[PDB]
Amino acid sequence: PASEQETLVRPKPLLLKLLKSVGAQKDTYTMKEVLFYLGQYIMTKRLYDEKQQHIVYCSNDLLGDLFGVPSFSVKEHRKIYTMIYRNLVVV
């Protein structure tokens, strides 16, 4: 039974590299999967303020190259989705 809301995506090379560091290599991922893995990448590289864990600092990491920003709050969903879509194509 199909989820009509699902999004299937093919990541650009740098995003694929970050996904493979934390997760499995696939040709296509779902958006939910990409969001999960990006969050888990931030957790394992400790790219947040220990005292303010909803703020991400990514400028000193490939994630900052991927997103094109030095930092962001996890509340900034439009920004985060927008930067993610700039790093993939929808299948």
State yes or no: residue 62 binds ligand AU0 (CB under 6 A): no
Q: Is 49 in the site for Na ion (CB under 5 A)?
A: yes
Cα separation of the two ends of the chain: 19
Binding partner at 38 among Na ion, Cl ion, ligand AU0, none, C-beta below 5 to 8 Å by kind: ligand AU0
What DSSP state is assigned to residue 73?
A: E
Tally of CB atoms within 10 A around 2: 5
89 binds Cl ion per the rule CB under 5 A = no
* Of positions 10, 30, 35, 83, contacts Cl ion by CB under 5 A: 30
Q: Which option in ligand AU0, Cl ion, Na ion, none does residue 6 bind, with CB closer than 5 to 8 A by kind? A: Cl ion
Upper half-sphere CA count for residue 29 (Cβ side, 13 Å): 24
